[PDB]
Amino acid sequence: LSDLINLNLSDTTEKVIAEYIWIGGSGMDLRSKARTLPGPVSDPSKLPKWNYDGSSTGQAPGEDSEVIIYPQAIFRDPFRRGNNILVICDTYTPAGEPIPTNKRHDAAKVFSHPDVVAEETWYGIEQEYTLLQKDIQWPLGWPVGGFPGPQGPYYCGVGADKAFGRDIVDAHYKACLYAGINISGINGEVMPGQWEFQVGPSVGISAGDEVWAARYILERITEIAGVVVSFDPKPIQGDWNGAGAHTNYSTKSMRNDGGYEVIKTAIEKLGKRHKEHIAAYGEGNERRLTGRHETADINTFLWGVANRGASVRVGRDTEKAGKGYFEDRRPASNMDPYVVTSMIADTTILWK
Amino acid sequence: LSDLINLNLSDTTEKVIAEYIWIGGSGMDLRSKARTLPGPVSDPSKLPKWNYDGSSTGQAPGEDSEVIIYPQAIFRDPFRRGNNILVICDTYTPAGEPIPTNKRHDAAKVFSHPDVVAEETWYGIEQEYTLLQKDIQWPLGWPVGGFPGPQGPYYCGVGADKAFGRDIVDAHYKACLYAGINISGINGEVMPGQWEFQVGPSVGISAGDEVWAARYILERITEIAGVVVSFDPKPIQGDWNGAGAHTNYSTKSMRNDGGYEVIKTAIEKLGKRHKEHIAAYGEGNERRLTGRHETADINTFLWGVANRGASVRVGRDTEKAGKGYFEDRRPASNMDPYVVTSMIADTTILWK
Amino acid sequence: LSDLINLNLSDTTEKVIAEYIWIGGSGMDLRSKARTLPGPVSDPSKLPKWNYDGSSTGQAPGEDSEVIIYPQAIFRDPFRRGNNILVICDTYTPAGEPIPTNKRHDAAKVFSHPDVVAEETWYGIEQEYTLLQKDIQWPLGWPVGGFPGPQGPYYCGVGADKAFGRDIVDAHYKACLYAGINISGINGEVMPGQWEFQVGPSVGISAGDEVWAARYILERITEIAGVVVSFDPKPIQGDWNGAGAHTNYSTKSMRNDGGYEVIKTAIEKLGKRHKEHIAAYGEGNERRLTGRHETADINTFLWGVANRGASVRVGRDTEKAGKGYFEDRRPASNMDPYVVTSMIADTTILWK
Amino acid sequence: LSDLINLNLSDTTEKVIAEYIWIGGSGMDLRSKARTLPGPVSDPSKLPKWNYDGSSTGQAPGEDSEVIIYPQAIFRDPFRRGNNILVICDTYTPAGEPIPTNKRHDAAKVFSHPDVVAEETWYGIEQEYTLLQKDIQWPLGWPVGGFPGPQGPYYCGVGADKAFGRDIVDAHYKACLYAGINISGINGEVMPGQWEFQVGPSVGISAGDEVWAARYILERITEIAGVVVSFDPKPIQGDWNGAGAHTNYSTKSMRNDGGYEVIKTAIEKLGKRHKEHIAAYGEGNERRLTGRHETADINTFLWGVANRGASVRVGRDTEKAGKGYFEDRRPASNMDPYVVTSMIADTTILWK
Amino acid sequence: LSDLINLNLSDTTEKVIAEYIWIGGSGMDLRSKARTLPGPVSDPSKLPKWNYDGSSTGQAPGEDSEVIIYPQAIFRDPFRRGNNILVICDTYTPAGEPIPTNKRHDAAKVFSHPDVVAEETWYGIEQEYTLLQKDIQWPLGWPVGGFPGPQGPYYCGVGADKAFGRDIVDAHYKACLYAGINISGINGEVMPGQWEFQVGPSVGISAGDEVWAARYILERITEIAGVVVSFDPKPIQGDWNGAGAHTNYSTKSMRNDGGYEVIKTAIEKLGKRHKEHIAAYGEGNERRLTGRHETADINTFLWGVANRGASVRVGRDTEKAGKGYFEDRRPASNMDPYVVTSMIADTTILWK
């Protein structure tokens, strides 16, 4: 079936294949479908819109199930290659308003303000995932109906005993680099069969545009290998760690001289908003964040510099030179990056 | 056996391989066989006619079973590549008349009229299919003697849990783009293991040819993988949807200013012919069309703009701008594109 | 999943993938993780440092688990190709001191002296490994719950009966040559499924780098083949021989006329320090070194010219010409090249 | 192994093996082991007291892990047969006070009250369970990673595709009838692989004993079949009915003419105690009792004559004849029969 | 094969097969063969002697490999049944002196001392063993290259996933009860696949004999199941409890009223002999006895009333009533019962 999937269409025609991708009803799964266009295009403004049956996804009533999707971001296709592209789309109503599942409209509204634009907000998102076997929700390298050895050799270890699913991870890393996602590294986590990828400094809404892209690519890659991928914080319970997502924030004021006071003020503003942020960081965070294995408490807001378990973590270089980034470690691995980045920018700058 | 199937003959010889393809006795299955020609040919007029045994297919008596096949359409071969071609042929009688299974003669006669030629009728065909396991007529991704999970995630799903047979679909999409079929996109449908492909705006009789070509190509790609493909309107019964085929009609007068009145008149003329069209859209359509959750019914004719369950569906933008096209949703997935295109053209224009 | 792992990124971007590699808590296992850099880099001085969680490895307390890793050596990447690199790193403390597991600091301190720099010392390290089946601890090619034939045909055997896991060995040899490790040959040892590779003459701390590189590569290669690799001296007990590592030492004075007296003086200095060297060559080397068939013994120090069962072995051409190297055969196969090379250089030259 | 498990020791010796069974720390798991006795015995008061280690079960601290075992009931041994017996036992501290997980002490105190003794109380317990595959915890007859057909054919089914695990049910029914349990019927429930059994009319505390023996037998029989039994109320989520256990209750005053008034008064007495009863009758019952199909809800208490959603139901025959029992449908499959029976007796007979 | 193994020879002939069992060179393994005898016999002194090849076992030099076999105890054959018997034997040199591996001679001399004979010593033995898979030496019910769940559910478990290999335990229990062994209980230990059995109160040397016979039966039963028995103290390293045996000891003076003073004097006498006792009670016991969970240590001798970590424990009953036995928890599962019983008798009754 190869020699047909990997067939170069630029030798015989100029038509391109576009991949319209949107978010399903639950707010965590991705839906996509392809089309053909007369020629190459790289500006999202001049791409046609679509519609789809919202009843089949859970985002529209029965009588008028037409749901409109608008192209928003363009990346290079790492599966079809050539001149084909992936389109990260946003979903509206035929009247013209976003559906309640749509969250990029609010994010674009927040990031479009002159203040946030002048602040040059930069976000870096670290995301876990767990590779499970297909039919039984049992992670890779775990024997069927059997636990693996105790933790300790699975964190960045090399060998057939410790690295489970490294082919998928290397393929995902090269595919995300090829497509255009600003990926900044990979590593293996303490749980066996659990890995991590980081989307590096990316400005504004573009951040949320590409991390959502990476997930899509990752899932599709696993579809080739017959493996399930879970971003759920707690796929396995017991003495095994959870999966979470970390956010690195860097405004222009922080990177300049005297930015430590800016960081302190931003963290103080983030404080007293702990409950709303926790309630908007994604379902399942209750089980992941309980204090085990140096994890931040759900009901307490404390920030440190050297402690691994804290709400907000500030590095040594930032404490020394008084400038840099700061890291929030509360968001769960099944979050919505649009929401998290939006309200972080809201609390830091817009809020008074 | 590779390195021999994928062997380039253009480095050693000028001879080409042609694939004569025709429709079998049942009117739904395809038959084909290959031959060798001295050099490249691109015009269907200068291709030699061929013959076959009608008794082995079910289209001729015992005494004189020879059936003549006339080359009609030429496409590029996506399996042999090089300068080889696929020939979409038509079946006649040695005396000179079409056999009762032949339907392209009537369509060509209708489309050859000056009125239909001057009106630039364009058709678009949406075709459903289902991927079943080989020995047991049981769809892909369904456990043997076991139903899959409830519907809802399989419509455009991405993970390994949702997309079944995606490699065949991508191969078919690229192969049809390579050959020359004006394919316009693909997607996955609500039933697991069920997919869709659109043949885009194509003018006149060529439309029909293209559709059949695509089907042939799919029928071959599946047999590389070891999967059965069914266009039957209802392969699996219960709370599972059925495969279907949609048609999009657009004449020149509809495409111009004041075309909404033309669309209304055409739909009015299509009405009162409901029973004949229903009886001429494909066996098994009774089991698919049942009024399930506001969908088309066999015994009732309805048309609307947002109610997608009507017999005739007209888009919102087409109504508000007047110009555009319209869509008929009654034809079954085992139809004959010649017949439906001919009937639509005759009712809209030729009929008084 | 190929066509994505083996995807050339130099055709679309300038960014490189770097592989930071360090030594885990036990002093014998290797941990690694990757990142992306804006462009190509070849000097280790101008590479950024990292940090990692020492708690997950066993090299830091609970409260402040951050362990800093400094790039030290650069090699080409034999798995990613292109402009990607492997970085052999060294572990420190955020205060600035090496952790007790760090051994390259001492080695660099010893090799940075003017005396050792002026007197060029070259080291060659022979390393033996065993290939075992994955889930069981049973060596490759042995039957499950059964022993192979008696020894004698497995030393450099050619047929399918004697060469077990040769594909891994050939791949490792080619990959180590490609990356830049100064490899100098391979062979198969007397035990079936056991092999050996030589890292050739390389000067100073560089040796301790590239050996640790080769091991990493080897282990990663086994991940592709689903095989476990063991450098443990005695993976199998009975009448089956053990795995060891040998060190060829040659300073500048030994390479010149009258160097036999230098070799004799160096061996005299190395003697009477048997206990410390043995205790620093590994823990549990008594199992491999017993004295069977006149081999080396732990409690006794001996040196000869042809007695293979001696602590120090001197080749025939060396006393024939009075110049050359000498071979120490005490270190175990799970040694630390930093420590061994440091002790040999310190005893030979620095000590009085 | 067999012909030794089925070995008649009465031909050779007069000693008898006694099997002691107690309830573990979780309050719903059963532990048991074996003892050798000089001769046959039928009186539980003639059986010696005994002990076990509470640390290994979760019932005592490390300093005092000794937990004493008091024989309370005797049945026949169905697996060893002959003169060997099963003993149902109670758990006590070395000092003489029952441990917190002990619940038969309070029930025996309640059932020894002169009013309860003279009222001749009769219970019948309807207990449902689910059979699961050993490794993957997927119900019996369910394809791995799939679902069976919709509900409706499995209730009291007879075919090979409708009754899944009737061998285990037949073996358990015969074994409980041979041991001495009053088991009064079995059938297959609506879900595949789910069954129930009825422990018939047993007076007072004895009822709670028999059920705690019946469960034991079931478990061991599943151990012979390599299947896992589950008394969890809702093992599978979706449109699949759960497993809840009910209790029919009657008293001598209810067996007399005009007892419908007494049944009514007991019904109001059991009412307005819904909170404590639901709290003490099993956790995890919220998933089972939701309100679907007009059934019982946790937050609402309902009693009627024909409504199948009633928390407490009274049959037509009770109204007609004027006397009988009434059925409590509140508890789940994972109850403790002791607390249920004792609470019903308290809230009906003695508590004012 | 069967229906011939279970063949009754009493219907046809009067000859009886006698099975001779002895202890091999390693001091732990058992060897055995079969002999044909003219008729039934029940007295060990009426049985002929054997001789066997000590070279093939590891007990005699090549020039004199003849080792004489002395019958000592007689039990019934559980595998051949009928009138066939098992014989426990003693090993001797041709001249007449015992071989070094013989240990029953010294215990027989000790137990024939008039004071020991008059004291009528009573012993009980607690033997714990582990069942392993045949080829890979991984415990029963453990996934290959994996681990089961944490400890806690397996102690005296009943389910299919908690008790592993209970068929072997049942067969062994009934076979030992039919043979004539005083076996007084079985249960499942905390580790999966690990069990124990208690050899009950047997007077003097006879105790040890029975234990050996018991071991023999166990091994042969495992041979039927294709499983490997292991009496090694610590087969699996990690957070898994080992297999250590125990010995309860009583004397007529201890059973007499006011015997707690005698028990205390015996405990004091057994104290300060810890070095010799630990040396002679099994090697490889260092791994089992470390000090975890406040247990016994090799370098610490402790005796108490309730501390479960005591080397010699005394129950509450022997303090309340003042009469009873005491339990030595020092020896491992691979003891020789002869030497343990003999030294316990010596250091209490005759040694001053």
Author numbering:
A (entry chain F), B (entry chain G), C (entry chain H), D (entry chain D), E (entry chain C): 4 to 355
Q: What's in the article?
A:
MALS analysis shows the GSII from Glycine max being largely a homogeneous decamer in solution. To elucidate the detailed mechanism of how the interactions between two GSII pentameric rings remotely trigger enzymatic activity, we next employed single-particle cryo-EM imaging technique and first determined the structures of GmGSβ2 decamer, as well as that of the CsGSIb that adopts decameric configuration (thereafter named as CsGSIbDec). 3D classifications of 104,717 and 43,876 particles for GmGSβ2 and CsGSIbDec, respectively, revealed that both molecules were arranged in D5 symmetry with two pentameric rings stacked in a head-to-head manner, a strikingly conserved structural feature for type II GS species. The active sites of GmGSβ2, CsGSIbDec are structurally highly similar to each other, as well as to that of the maize GSII, suggesting the catalysis mechanisms of these plant GSIIs are essentially identical. The overall buried inter-ring surfaces for both GmGSβ2 and CsGSIbDec amount to ~2000 Å2, that is approximately only 400 Å2 per individual monomer–monomer interaction.
One such an example is glutamine synthetases (GSs) (EC 6.3.1.2), one of the most ancient functioning enzymes in existence and a central enzyme in nitrogen metabolism of all living organisms, catalyzing the formation of glutamine by condensation of glutamate with ammonia using ATP as an energy source. Cryo-EM structure determination of GS in both the catalytically active and inactive assembly states allows us to reveal an unanticipated self-assembly-induced disorder-order transition paradigm, in which the remote interactions between two subcomplex entities significantly rigidify the otherwise structurally fluctuating active sites, thereby regulating activity.
